[PDB]
Amino acid sequence: LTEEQIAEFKEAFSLFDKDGDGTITTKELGTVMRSLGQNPTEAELQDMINEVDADGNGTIDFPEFLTMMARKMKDTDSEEEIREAFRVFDKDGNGYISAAELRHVMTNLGEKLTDEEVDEMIREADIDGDGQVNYEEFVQMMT
Amino acid sequence: KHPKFEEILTRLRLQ
Amino acid sequence: PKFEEILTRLRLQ
Ligand SMILES: [Ca+2]
Ligand SMILES: [Ca+2]
Ligand SMILES: [Ca+2]
Ligand SMILES: [Ca+2]
């Protein structure tokens, strides 16, 4: 992981680790949530800490925080790959992948498909039954 | 309501 | 053709 990304994830961690001791406590997390309009109980805060606290000592340290942030970054990079794929297929940018668009891009990607093959692919994905693949449908097929 | 850390981080960046 | 290849193909392109 790049040191630029570490410094970035450190700035994020510092929003929770409000005193820079290197740990996020339930008390700190309580202040965070209160600052955003909630008023959590000790139990609720222990639950939230436990989402990230890998060694179960009841606090989150920066290595545990960074493990979580790196997993989320891989999720966001996957999501961005699928979003870019949708833009490439949606040649005219109207939010729908048509059969014509699917066939034309597949040709460019080294896969020559016939009409019936393309139509079967659209039916597999076309949850709402309108004959085209919108972004929501695409995500469902691609995840 | 039962928020995840991701939303929390987003809102913290704002304020 | 599965959609997973189409993602892989796109990545190479
Ligand atoms: Ca602290
Ligand atoms: Ca810990
Ligand atoms: Ca389109
Ligand atoms: Ca549809």
Side-chain angles (χ1 to χ4, degrees):
Chain A
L1 228 169
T2 65
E3 60 155 49
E4 193 35 38
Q5 286 171 153
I6 292 167
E8 165 192 344
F9 292 156
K10 203 174 151 146
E11 296 168 49
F13 179 76
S14 79
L15 290 179
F16 297 83
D17 174 19
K18 283 183 79 70
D19 68 345
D21 78 315
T23 74
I24 308 164
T25 64
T26 56
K27 189 185 303 196
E28 285 169 314
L29 182 59
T31 73
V32 163
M33 306 289 289
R34 282 165 155 278
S35 82
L36 299 169
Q38 292 297 327
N39 204 329
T41 69
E42 181 72 13
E44 294 177 328
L45 290 164
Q46 290 165 335
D47 202 8
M48 292 181 72
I49 291 292
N50 195 66
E51 295 187 45
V52 188
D53 173 24
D55 61 8
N57 69 349
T59 64
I60 304 165
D61 66 20
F62 184 43
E64 290 171 332
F65 186 88
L66 194 123
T67 293
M68 173 273 293
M69 291 300 280
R71 179 177 51 75
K72 296 312 296 170
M73 165 174 289
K74 291 333 185 92
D75 298 346
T76 71
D77 292 344
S78 180
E79 294 155 6
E80 173 62 28
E81 185 186 357
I82 287 156
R83 189 179 296 124
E84 283 179 19
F86 185 90
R87 283 193 295 267
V88 169
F89 278 99
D90 179 18
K91 187 187 188 300
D92 66 5
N94 74 350
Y96 292 107
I97 301 160
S98 68
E101 284 168 340
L102 183 49
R103 202 175 60 83
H104 168 79
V105 177
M106 287 299 279
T107 297
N108 296 336
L109 294 179
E111 178 87 83
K112 264 178 290 307
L113 301 173
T114 64
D115 286 348
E116 289 266 354
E117 291 169 335
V118 169
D119 283 357
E120 190 254 33
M121 289 177 62
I122 296 179
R123 298 196 310 277
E124 282 178 2
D126 180 23
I127 296 171
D128 69 13
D130 79 344
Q132 301 171 298
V133 185
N134 72 16
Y135 174 64
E136 287 186 316
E137 288 164 347
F138 188 80
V139 169
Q140 285 297 305
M141 281 281 4
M142 283 313 225
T143 59
Chain B
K1 317 143 252 106
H2 312 333
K4 289 98 157 224
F5 258 75
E6 160 46 21
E7 168 170 332
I8 302 178
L9 188 53
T10 295
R11 312 206 178 256
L12 267 207
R13 286 175 161 162
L14 258 122
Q15 61 149 250
Chain C
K2 248 169 308 191
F3 275 73
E4 174 82 71
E5 218 180 273
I6 78 153
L7 206 57
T8 297
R9 291 184 173 274
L10 208 31
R11 157 84 75 121
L12 293 161
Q13 174 76 3

